[PDB]
Amino acid sequence: MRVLLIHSDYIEYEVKDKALKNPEPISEDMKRGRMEEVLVAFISVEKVDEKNPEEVSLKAIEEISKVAEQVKAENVFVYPFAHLSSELAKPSVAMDILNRVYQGLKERGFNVGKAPFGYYKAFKISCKGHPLAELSRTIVPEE
Amino acid sequence: MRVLLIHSDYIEYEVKDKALKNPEPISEDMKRGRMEEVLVAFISVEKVDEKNPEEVSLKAIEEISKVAEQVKAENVFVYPFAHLSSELAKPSVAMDILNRVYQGLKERGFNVGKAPFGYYKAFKISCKGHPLAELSRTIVPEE
């Protein structure tokens, strides 16, 4: 897994066309969203993550929480984002892990939003300028 | 080299703290910038690019131009962005290549903007939702 963490004044998205034939099933509330004062976690789920979805997710949950604690973010947004790696996971495993991370973060007491997997999305973001406001993390299972 | 190409209604930045000890020397006009209706090229210059800075840059110039032609963008923005790879180039070579790409794109008749290398930057972007509006490219020299 590769994660890009961006501490942002806001994130906003609107689901547009489908990018896969079998994308994530969505409800009407899921086709747009906005959070403010938010650590946006852009996530690429990778092939090696398929060895241990649970271990990878837990490690991601810990890393994302730690950065949110550092920048004092109470809001986290899980934004699926394939472009951080070419070594991508099967879409079913990607969704599995994205969900594990999303749920895990709520279980830690954050307010967490998400964008659905497998659609093209318009999105707006404003990245605060700070040293810890734009970070990247590599998280992989122990083999 | 890894490039993330985002067709955007706008990009905007404001240079904040320095992220390196020897960043790119900047003038006062360089510390903020805005373009609209713009193909934003987020660029990670990689270690393997040091074998042939010229060849890599030319390949990048061609790929970025082609995408701008597809989405009919007349404005391009070169945004240095280390997070697309862990296999990073020496900062001097990174700046060399970023400049080659920037200049090359102007020589093709685009209006081109850039953000300086080596600073933390606040930035705002709005990505159009379209299928070709958020793309990634790997460009490396032939060995």
Question: Which residue is listed with tokens 């241990």?
Answer: A52
Q: Which residue range is the domain that position A90 belongs to?
A: 1-139
Please give the Cα distance from A141 to B104 (Å, whole number): 42
Locate B135 and state its tokens: 């793309």
Based on C-alpha coordinates, what's the Rg of chain A? 14
| Residue in A89, A93, A98 with CA at minimum distance from that of residue A57 | A98
Chain A contact set for B19 (CB, 8 A): 131
Please give the Cα distance from B118 to B108 (Å, whole number): 26
Please give the Cα distance from B132 to A7 (Å, whole number): 26
**A42 bridge partner residues:** A4, A79
How many Cβ contacts (< 8 angstroms) between chains A and B? 63
**B33 bridge partner residues:** B13
Q: Look at A126 and B122 and tell me if their CB atoms are within 8 Å.
A: yes
| Residue in A126, A85, A78 with CA at minimum distance from that of residue B127 | A126
Query: Which chain A residue shows the shortest CA-CA distance from B10?
Result: A124
Q: Between A91-107 and A53-70, two packed helices, what is the crossing angle to 10 degrees?
A: 50
B119-127 vs A32-44, strand pairing mode: unpaired
Kindly report the number of other CB atoms within 10 A of residue A143's CB atom: 6
Locate B94 and state its tokens: 């990174």
Q: Look at B129 and A16 and tell me if their CB atoms are within 8 Å.
A: yes
Chain B contact set for A80 (CB, 8 A): none
Please give the Cα distance from A71 to B96 (Å, whole number): 33
Contacts of B40 (CB under 8 A, 6+ apart): B5, B6, B7, B8, B11, B76, B77, B79, B125
Q: Are B108 and B28 in contact (CB under 8 A)?
A: no
Top residue of A4, A7, A16, A83 to mutate, by most chain B CBs within 10 Å, is A83
Residue A83 contacts B where some CB pair is shorter than 8 Å: yes
Region of residue B72 (left: phi > 0; alpha: psi -120 to 50; beta: else): left
| Residue in A38, A32, A34 with CA at minimum distance from that of residue A9 | A38
Please give the Cα distance from B33 to B114 (Å, whole number): 8
A32-44 vs A75-80, strand pairing mode: parallel
Chain B contact set for A82 (CB, 8 A): 136
**Can you give the CATH number for the domain in which B23 is found?**
3.50.80.10
The phi and psi torsions of A96 (rounded to 5 degrees) equal: -55, -55
Residue A106 contacts B where some CB pair is shorter than 8 Å: no
Method of structure determination: X-ray
Chain B contact set for A127 (CB, 8 A): 121-124
The total number of structural domains that make up chain A: 1
Residue B32 contacts A where some CB pair is shorter than 8 Å: no
Task: List, in sequence order, the alpha helices (H) in chain B.
Answer: 53-70, 91-107
Chain B contact set for A19 (CB, 8 A): 131
